[PDB]
Write a protein that binds this ligand. Structure first.
Ligand code: CLA
Ligand code: CLA
Ligand code: CLA
Ligand code: CLA
Ligand code: CLA
Ligand code: CLA
Ligand code: CLA
Ligand code: CLA
Ligand code: CLA
Ligand SMILES: CC1=C(C#C/C(C)=C/C=C/C(C)=C/C=C/C=C(C)/C=C/C=C(C)/C=C/[C@@]23O[C@]2(C)C[C@@H](O)CC3(C)C)C(C)(C)C[C@H](O)C1
Ligand code: SF4
Lengths: 47, 40, 161, 741, 178, 180
């Protein structure tokens, strides 16, 4: 395991995704956990 | 919660329902983990 | 061997039953595609069926002409696990339950309000009685020897004969 | 003046009376001395009129109890929608309704019960449902599961709101009896406000969301490419592309050019050929017209302003020579007594449920519900049973009103008094009607059985030996078939195809077909009449003789439900109106069982089936009703024995649950006969012996055990009898119809 | 004498909000009349504190993350639910919230505990009673700001697809132009 | 403004165990208030018994990977497959030894009332002190508190060892050294 601090960096910088064009409302609505048929099924606890 | 609600939960039907639900859960989980045991 | 029965390991009818069950599931299996929840669930069903049949064969149960296990309950220790061991287990559990009930009744009567103690259980002491009933065979014997298990005969109502 | 007046904080929120079980009743508040106390607790739980004496408190309790019931109903609607969303093949069924079997329940694999997850199509394994909710949602326009999920969450929110309202309207702000007794305002709001605006809103929903989605689905657009309801709601261009009249806007409504909306507001009648169900445009027009009717109706009764009627004067004005004072005092009776209102409302609710059953099968309202034979049978039978139960509740609460809230001072010489004063004539004439009707109707069957057994078919009451034709039913059917041309010119097709016309069919299966009536229909209808008449005899005798009788002049003093008045006068067993209800529940059970058996056999023999390309019609049983329904032997052989095969042969399959429930229902029905035949004295003596056995081991309880009361033994026997019978028929019908259809 | 709200001076004061911190009278919809103030204020402080932690954590995870967790802020929840590191938060926060529901039960029954007081003050900030009222008001102010802050963070992040500022691409130029 | 706050959870009322004389009472840790319901002496008798069993178990579990009883059959370095592989008639004899000790120590006193029917009989004072450390009453409180704390730590430690072995499939020390 990568113990953060001793055998790994304490905090890694996050991926800067760069400023760009916006997404589409349909694009991030047909993947939401409450307004997508498959998103609802992917929101059930796996367990 | 309070002495009153604890007494109500200690009433006979609530206790029977809780205890029989616990017993049914024990039996069901035993069946899940040791299924189809016709004999010892 | 007893009563003309044979073990389920060398039971052609038992094997035929196993193959029939397996073939029935695998048929029902045709409706669903690979990798789906229903497909994997039916695969679990087939595995559990095969495991059950293998376990029944290994356990030494006797299979009759109909090809189903037959339990022998006469006292022979070759088939103790069928009735004798489960029998003692149930007897212990049932005596546990009865002893917990009896001891709680003995407590609840001494209370100032036994009628309300029966319908509103004093759970803190009731759990104590349930725990203490684990040693009921010795407790029952001790109470019998001390004359506290049985109420005498003329202290119990009896109707006009 | 009609106004809102409430009491602030009338009751404190505390668990002390949760801990105290019998707080509500004066007798039970002391505590238990016998096990009868436990039973009396549940028996008198919701008897507010016996618990208290204040009509205000009774009304407040009833109002908040109604809120609790509404919360439970909302949770139930939530369960339906959520299970459809999560554990159902609704998407597959929507893509292919004819081939896919609707299913919205999945069992876990624990003890090998996973076999119940049968093959329902669409790569889904579960228990087939028969509630019609899939067709309901298709009519409503739901095409995806997110919609089902969100309406389920909304239902949960509504259930929580109802629980909060029930708490608030009893513990924080409870109304007054003056508020409760504003019946005129209540009727105005329920006609114009509840029913009228409910119909108006449903019509708007239909016109805006259901017609476009359903028309596109029938055209062939798959659910994925259907425009969403929020798009369809405001996109008038798409609505104009679908229905051209939408481009004209609301000006043809505000000006009285209502004919411009003829495309989406139709009077076509009949059934849609595609879905084999009622036209949704017709349904929208129907609900809109009803909204107008109810909003018009709800402005009748008086309120804070001068205009309006008063039910008191309306009743008091209706009196005739043969009725004395007429309806005087009934307004006071129905404003003071909740039991009278409960009686009337239960009677109407039950009769309305029966009417719903009779109408839904004949005019399938939801798409692809006619071909779904399990759904039709299940809904018809369910609503018939609910109707019978509600009617007997009506009789019971009428009897309760007679026992408790009746008083001659208010009813001196009104219709209630005049009815009580010749109850003997009423009951004797109904008794003669029952004997005559039953003798003739069942003697037709017995005569037919005797002639068949003697080998004399020429002497039967058959369609070809001695015809008993229903000439009036046939005449009415002919009139309804000719109606669309002559007496309903603007209607294009018949109201129902049962009267006559074409044979509506979707794919191979037949959705609706004309139902022909003959000798067997005559016999079974007169059997229905006899059963209804005997049930009315029992219930009406119980209601009329609730006060007293020639046997017990002071029956009202004993109470509503009491065991007897001793073995004197030869025996006064079951003299109570409660016992009359107990006896009438058996008779409505018999009535509804015969009705559902008639429905099942008639529809499988003569309507349901498949139609081939050449026009050959093949029915499930093969039209054997017309010739085998003439004898009790034919009823026993060709219906019970013949159709029990699908139930008894169900083991090892998905219907194994139906087989198990069949056996269990038989067991419970048999178990009930113990309580129905036995008596309390035997069981009390047996309990005495068992109590001796326990006392010998020093474990006899402080709460002494007792045999059940006589009324309780009757109630337990009746409940087990009804549960066993209804469960037997439930399993039998469901297994048979799911297997064959 | 009639009491008017200091935030809605066209309405009469509720009279149920007396003796509480941050009492400008903002309650047009009358929740205090129905629900108890102790329950409402415990909920307010819980939302305030969770929202402060959430708005700090969202921005922090937009910049830095532990070596094992290589997910962005949006997919972090799903990735960590799959990994099992959200169950480890729900178990150790659910323990805390079991103790919390015992506490709110006690204070609603009248134990003596305040609405949101857990006594958690290790470093001694505000141990003087004079500073405690001011710090309570400042806590409420910062938390009620952080609620809107986190709401804007999540909504603008999903709406824009940009990492820290949650601003459209055109908003990083010519936003002060005549 | 709690009148009698708990010394451990100061936003909760004092439990009954806090105002008692058993050892370790001040912490006052009882969020669920189980001391009000359960008999307090009976629970110290259970606490001490569990802690003693667990603080025999945890060193045993942790050192059975390193060491073997010379010549013992069925040995495995990890306790779970060790108990799976060891002959049943050794575990049976261990259980019989424990049962004999329990029965003879608790003769005629197995119920909440029968045990502690005697006022002298203290929670967990079974009388096992061959070396007589208890005669010195100056350090009795120190030793009692140390026994209680060590037993509790041993319960948690044994639980952790067993569940870490379930997670990893490897013994305690191997699982620990494969982290760093
Ligand atoms: C037992 C394992 C372990 C060990 C030995 C260390 C050791 C270290 N970590 Mg840590 N770390 C660990 C687990 C561990 N970490 C875990 C599980 C995480 C994830 C939450 C982190 C996350 C983490 C970060 C983000 C950083 C470190 C850093 C450090 C260093 C400074 C520690 C310090 O200031 O302590 C101060 C001690 C306390 C405040 C007491 C805390 C509570 C006690 C332990 C109870 C040190 C090398 C820093 C680094 O990279 O230095 C080069 C650093 O920036 N660690
Ligand atoms: C009073 C009569 C009676 C008796 C003697 C039994 C006995 C048994 N039933 Mg049960 N059973 C009964 C009534 C009875 N049943 C009834 C009324 C029903 C209907 C609900 C069932 C339905 C039923 C099912 C569906 C199953 C059983 C199973 C079992 C077995 C449970 C063993 C087990 O898992 O222990 C495990 C205990 C430990 C590991 C400890 C055992 C042979 C299970 C089995 O395996 O059967 C072979 C099983 O699958 N029973
Ligand atoms: C109906 C009367 C009856 C009764 C009361 C008993 C009683 C007993 N039989 Mg059984 N037994 C019976 C009929 C009966 N048997 C018959 C008809 C047969 C012939 C098939 C047997 C064959 C038989 C065998 C082979 C054995 C027993 C044994 C036993 C004992 C079982 C003890 C136990 O498991 O606990 C017990 C004394 C066992 C025994 O003797 O244990 C010492 C034993 O091994 N019985
Ligand atoms: C337009 C106004 C209006 C509306 C919409 C309703 C609606 C309702 N009233 Mg009525 N009611 C009204 C005015 C109104 N009332 C007035 C003015 C009075 C005083 C005279 C009453 C007095 C009154 C009583 C005493 C009772 C009702 C009840 C009911 C319910 C009847 C059962 C039903 O069909 O539920 C249909 C349910 C729905 C359509 C779901 C929506 C539910 C709400 C509106 C949200 C229903 C929710 C009964 C009830 O349930 O009480 C709790 C009842 O016992 N009402
Ligand atoms: C409560 C029920 C209800 C509701 C909420 C709505 C709502 C709407 N209708 Mg109406 N509508 C209703 C019943 C209802 N309708 C009924 C019963 C009819 C049949 C006479 C119509 C016939 C109708 C037409 C023909 C049109 C609307 C349209 C509209 C919009 C109103 C525009 C505005 O305010 O100006 C809106 C989507 C307009 C629209 O936007 O259509 C897409 C429009 O053209 N409606
Ligand atoms: C709007 C509906 C309605 C309302 C508000 C009432 C209200 C009332 N009825 Mg009821 N009643 C109704 C419908 C209604 N009834 C119907 C439909 C019938 C016909 C069957 C009756 C017949 C009837 C009689 C004959 C009597 C009442 C009585 C009462 C009063 C007391 C009831 C009580 O406390 O029960 C509390 C609840 C119970 C005791 C539980 C009942 C459980 C039933 C019997 C079985 C449920 C089975 C379940 C659904 C399925 C089990 C499945 C299995 C596999 C486990 C109360 C005023 C009694 C009275 O004295 O009135 C003044 C009375 O004697 N009612
Ligand atoms: C098959 C079983 C059975 C039968 C035959 C009857 C018969 C009757 N019940 Mg019912 N009843 C039953 C079960 C049955 N009951 C059960 C299980 C219960 C308990 C819930 C009740 C409870 C009950 C009550 C509470 C009441 C009835 C009533 C009646 C009578 C209805 C009037 C009628 O049509 O009479 C005509 C006779 C029949 C329908 C029987 C068969 C007739 C055949 C066709 C022959 C008739 C011709 C001729 C005269 C005789 C044949 C020749 C002969 C000389 C050889 C009738 C005597 C009601 C009553 O008395 O109303 C007046 C009534 O109040 N019953
Ligand atoms: C509302 C509170 C909240 C919630 C629900 C989460 C949830 C999450 N954070 Mg965390 N986070 C928070 C506040 C919160 N954070 C705060 C305040 C900070 C700033 C220190 C961080 C900094 C942070 C980092 C750097 C990372 C996460 C990550 C994660 C994810 C894994 C859990 C983890 O390792 O957390 C670690 C959380 C901490 C070290 C903070 C502990 C201190 C808390 C807030 C209590 C302080 C008072 C005592 C998970 C989605 C990881 C991830 O998946 O990133 C993509 C990750 O790498 N968080
Ligand atoms: C909860 C306690 C516990 C339990 C249930 C077991 C169970 C087991 N151990 Mg043991 N073990 C324990 C504690 C325990 N151990 C302790 C504390 C140690 C010392 C580190 C060991 C060291 C140990 C080894 C080295 C081995 C086992 C092994 C075994 C297995 C076979 C039995 C055996 O050979 O025991 C051997 C028992 C011992 C060597 C000594 C036990 C110490 C007892 C419990 C102390 C109690 C007495 C007390 C201190 C004396 C008071 C004196 C006073 C009068 C003055 C079995 C699974 C074998 C194995 O690995 O099989 C897979 C094996 O080889 N154990
Ligand atoms: C304050 C408050 C409340 C609250 C709160 C909230 C929301 C608190 C949130 C706290 C939070 C968010 C705490 C995270 C901790 C994360 C840790 C310790 C991570 C360990 C990580 C470890 C040990 C390892 C990670 C790994 O990557 C490593 C290093 C190596 C990789 O190979 C893989 C693995 C996975 C092994 C209440 C209770 C709701 C109400 C009350 O009123 C007020
Ligand atoms: S059995 Fe019951 S109803 Fe019949 S006479 Fe005796 S007491 Fe009366």
């Amino acid at each position: 395991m990568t113990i953060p601090g001793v055998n790994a960096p304490g905090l890694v910088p996050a991926t800067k995704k760069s400023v760009g064009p916006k997404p589409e409302w349909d694009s991030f609505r047909d993947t939401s956990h409450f307004w997508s048929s498959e998103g609802i099924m992917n929101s059930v606890p796996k367990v | 919660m309070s002495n009153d609600l604890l007494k109500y939960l200690s009433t006979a039907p609530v206790l029977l329902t809780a205890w029989m639900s616990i017993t049914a859960g024990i039996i069901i989980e035993i069946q899940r983990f040791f299924p189809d045991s016709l004999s010892f | 061997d007893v009563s003309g029965l044979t073990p389920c390991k060398d039971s052609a009818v038992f094997k035929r039953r196993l193959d029939g069950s397996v073939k029935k599931l695998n048929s029902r299996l045709a409706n669903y595609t690979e990798g789906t929840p229903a497909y994997i669930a039916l695969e679990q069903q087939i595995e559990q069926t095969k495991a059950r049949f293998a376990k029944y064969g290994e356990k030494g149960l006797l299979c009759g002409a109909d090809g189903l296990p037959h339990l022998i309950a006469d006292g022979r220790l070759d088939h103790a696990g069928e009735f004798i061991i489960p029998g003692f287990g149930f007897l212990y559990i049932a005596g546990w339950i009865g002893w917990a009930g009896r001891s709680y009744l003995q407590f609840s009567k001494k209370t100032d309000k036994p009628n309300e103690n029966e319908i509103i259980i004093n759970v803190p002491v009731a759990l104590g009685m349930m725990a203490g009933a684990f040693i009921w065979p010795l407790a029952a014997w001790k109470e019998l020897i001390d004359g506290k298990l049985l109420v005498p005969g003329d202290e119990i109502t009896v109707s006009p004969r | 003046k009609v106004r809102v007046i409430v009491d602030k904080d009338p009751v404190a929120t505390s668990f002390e009376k949760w801990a105290q079980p019998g707080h509500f009743s004066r007798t039970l508040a002391k505590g238990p001395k016998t096990t009868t106390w436990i039973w009396n607790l549940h028996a008198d739980a919701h008897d507010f009129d016996s618990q208290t004496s204040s009509l205000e408190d009774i009304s407040r309790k009833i109002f908040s109890a109604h809120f609790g019931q509404l919360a439970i109903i909302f949770l139930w609607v939530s369960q339906a929608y959520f299970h459809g969303a999560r554990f159902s093949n609704y998407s597959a069924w929507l893509q292919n309704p004819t081939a896919i079997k609707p299913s919205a329940q999945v069992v876990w694999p624990i003890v090998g019960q996973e076999i119940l997850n049968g093959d329902v199509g669409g790569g889904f394994s579960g228990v087939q449902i028969t509630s019609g909710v899939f067709q309901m949602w298709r009519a409503s326009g739901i095409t995806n599961e997110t919609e089902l999920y969100w309406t389920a969450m909304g239902g949960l929110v509504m259930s929580a709101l109802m629980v909060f309202a029930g708490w608030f309207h009893y513990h924080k702000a409870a109304p007054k009896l003056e508020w409760f007794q504003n019946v005129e305002s209540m009727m105005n709001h329920h006609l114009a406000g509840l029913l009228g605006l409910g119909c108006l809103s449903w019509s708007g929903h239909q016109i805006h969301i259901s017609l476009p989605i359903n028309k596109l689905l029938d055209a062939g657009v798959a659910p994925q490419e259907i425009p969403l309801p929020h798009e369809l709601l405001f996109n008038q261009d798409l609505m104009a592309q679908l229905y051209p009249s939408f481009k004209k806007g609301l000006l043809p409504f505000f000006t009285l050019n209502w004919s411009e909306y003829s495309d989406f507001l139709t009077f076509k009648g009949g059934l849609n050929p595609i879905t084999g169900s009622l036209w949704l445009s017709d349904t929208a027009h129907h609900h809109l017209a009803l909204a107008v009717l109810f909003i018009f109706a709800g402005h009748m009764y008086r309120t804070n302003w001068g205009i309006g009627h008063s039910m008191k004067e309306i009743l008091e004005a209706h009196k005739g020579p043969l009725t004395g004072e007429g309806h005087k005092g009934l307004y006071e009776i129905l404003t003071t007594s909740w039991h009278a209102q409960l009686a009337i409302n239960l009677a109407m609710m039950g009769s309305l449920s029966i009417i719903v059953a009779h109408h839904m099968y004949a005019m399938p309202p939801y798409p692809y519900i006619g071909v779904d034979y399990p759904t039709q049978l299940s809904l018809f039978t369910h609503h018939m049973w609910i109707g019978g139960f509600c009617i007997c509740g009506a009789a019971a609460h009428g009897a309760i009103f007679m026992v408790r809230d009746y008083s001659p001072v208010q009813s001196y010489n009104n219709l209630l008094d005049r009815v009580l004063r010749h109850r003997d004539a009423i009951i004797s004439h109904l008794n003669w009607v029952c004997i005559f009707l039953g003798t003739h109707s069942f003697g037709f069957y017995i005569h037919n059985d005797t002639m068949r057994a003697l080998g004399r078919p020429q002497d039967m009451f058959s369609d070809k030996a001695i015809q008993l034709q229903p000439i009036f039913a046939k005449w009415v059917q002919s009139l309804h078939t000719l109606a669309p041309g002559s007496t309903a010119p603007n209607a294009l097709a018949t109201s129902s195809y049962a009267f006559g016309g074409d044979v509506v069919a979707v794919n191979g299966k037949i959705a609706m077909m004309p139902i022909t009536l003959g000798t067997a229909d005559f016999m079974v209808h007169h059997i229905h009449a006899f059963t209804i008449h005997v049930t009315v005899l029992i219930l009406l005798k119980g209601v009329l003789f609730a006060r007293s009788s020639r046997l017990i002049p002071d029956k009202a003093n004993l109470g509503f439900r009491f065991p007897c008045d001793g073995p004197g006068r030869g025996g006064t067993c079951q003299v109570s109106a409660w016992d009359h209800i107990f006896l009438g529940l058996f008779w409505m059970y018999n009535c509804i069982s015969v009705v559902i058996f008639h429905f099942s056999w008639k529809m499988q023999s003569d309507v349901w089936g498949t139609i081939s390309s050449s026009g050959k019609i093949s029915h499930v049983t093969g039209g054997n009703f017309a010739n085998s329904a003439l004898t009790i032997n034919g009823w026993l052989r060709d219906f019970l024995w013949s159709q029990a095969s699908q139930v008894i042969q169900s083991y090892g399959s998905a219907l194994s649950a139906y087989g198990l429930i069949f056996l269990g229902a038989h067991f419970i029905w048999a178990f009930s006969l113990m309580f129905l035949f036995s008596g309390r004295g035997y069981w009390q003596e047996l309990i005495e012996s068992i109590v001796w056995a326990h006392n010998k081991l020093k474990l006899a309880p402080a709460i002494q055990p007792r045999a059940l009361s006589i009324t309780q033994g009757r109630a337990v026997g009746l409940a087990h009898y009804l549960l066993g019978g209804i469960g037997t028929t439930w399993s039998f019908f469901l297994a048979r119809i799911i297997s064959v259809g | 004498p009639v009491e008017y709200s200091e935030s809605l001076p066209f309405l009469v004061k509720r009279k149920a909000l007396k003796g509480y911190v941050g009492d400008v009278g903002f309650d047009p919809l009358g929740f205090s009349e129905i629900l108890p103030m102790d329950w409402l204020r415990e909920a307010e402080l819980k939302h305030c504190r969770v929202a402060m932690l959430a708005t700090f954590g969202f921005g922090f995870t937009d910049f830095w993350h532990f070596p094992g967790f290589d997910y962005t802020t949006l997919e972090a929840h799903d990735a960590c639910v799959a990994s099992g590191a959200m169950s480890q938060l729900l178990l150790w926060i659910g323990l805390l919230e079991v103790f919390g529901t015992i506490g709110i039960d006690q204070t609603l029954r009248g134990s003596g505990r305040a609405a949101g007081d857990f006594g958690f003050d290790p470093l001694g900030f505000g141990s003087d009673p004079a500073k405690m009222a001011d710090l309570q008001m400042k806590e409420l102010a910062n938390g009620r700001l952080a609620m809107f802050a986190f709401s804007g963070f999540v909504t603008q992040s999903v709406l824009t697809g940009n990492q820290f500022p949650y601003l459209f691409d055109y908003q990083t130029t010519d936003v002060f132009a005549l | 403004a709690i009148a009698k706050p708990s010394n451990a959870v100061p936003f909760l009322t004092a439990p009954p165990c806090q105002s008692s004389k058993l050892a370790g009472a001040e912490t006052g840790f009882d969020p669920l208030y189980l001391s009000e319901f359960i008999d307090l002496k009976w629970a110290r008798e259970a606490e001490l018994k569990h802690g003693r069993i667990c603080m025999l178990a945890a060193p045993g579990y942790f050192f059975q990977e390193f060491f073997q009883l010379p010549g013992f059959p069925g040995y495995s370095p990890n306790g779970i497959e060790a108990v799976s592989s060891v002959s049943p008639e050794a575990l049976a004899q261990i259980v019989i030894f424990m049962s004999v000790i329990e029965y003879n120590s608790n003769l005629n006193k197995w119920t909440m009332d029968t045990m502690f029917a005697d006022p002298k009989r203290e929670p967990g004072n079974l009388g096992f002190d061959p070396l007589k450390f208890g005669e010195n009453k100056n350090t009795r409180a120190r030793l009692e508190m140390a026994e209680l704390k060590n037993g509790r730590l041993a319960m948690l430690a044994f639980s952790g060892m067993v569940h870490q072995t379930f997670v990893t499939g490897k013994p305690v020390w191997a699982s620990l050294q494969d982290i760093f």
